[PDB]
Design a protein around this ligand. Structure first.
Ligand SMILES: CNC(=O)c1c[nH]c2ncnc(N[C@H](c3ccc4c(c3)S(=O)(=O)CCC4)C(C)C)c12
Length: 168
């Protein structure tokens, strides 16, 4: 039903809110929820762990069956799988993990996957323990994504820093 509320409008297609992506999925019932995935789809911690736990492990079971038959994704790539109880679909996107030495230029390719969907609920790619500069990730999102993207950032200080930096 894509009923998003309480978002700040940054540009004509990019919105942001201080919220847990899981709670937004439950309230919004979006067509697509983006997962900040890794190449073998191991959803242990962070955003991926929160989304998986909210599906009572159904996401990990489905992802293990996908990997068994298809092998790992590439950095910058994506995979559409079921969204289970959280959304119609889950778009698993692999952004670069710069804390593990992966190339930050691939963050543009990671965001380009969003353009295949008219509207998406998403986290800020490569932020948190992946180590990319969050202000840079927001700039790449704004410059690359043309479809409607609703970013949920679950940290008040980071959300406030992003909004202030964007409005500079
Ligand atoms: C541990 N719980 C969470 O991180 C979240 C749960 N629910 C969430 N909704 C939104 N953002 C969340 N987190 C943010 C974040 C955004 C991107 C990425 C990560 C973490 S990561 O550390 O999982 C690595 C992969 C990329 C941080 C920056 C506030 C959570």
């Amino acid at each position: 039903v894509n009923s998003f509320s309480g978002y700040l409008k940054l540009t004509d297609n990019v919105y942001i809110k201080n919220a847990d992506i899981v709670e937004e999925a439950k309230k919004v019932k979006p067509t697509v929820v983006v997962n900040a995935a890794n190449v073998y789809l191991k959803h242990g911690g962070g955003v991926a762990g929160a989304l998986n736990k909210a599906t009572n492990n159904a996401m990990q079971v489905e992802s293990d069956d996908y990997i068994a038959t298809n092998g790992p994704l590439k950095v910058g790539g994506s995979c559409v799988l079921s969204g289970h109880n959280l959304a119609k679909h889950c778009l698993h996107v692999v952004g670069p993990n710069v804390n593990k030495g992966e190339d930050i230029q691939l963050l543009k390719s990671a965001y380009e996957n969003f353009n295949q969907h008219e509207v998406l609920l998403a986290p800020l790619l490569s932020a948190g323990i992946f180590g990319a500069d969050p202000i840079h990730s927001l700039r790449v999102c704004v410059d690359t994504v043309r479809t409607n993207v609703y970013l949920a950032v679950f940290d008040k200080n980071l959300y406030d820093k992003l909004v202030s930096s964007f409005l500079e």
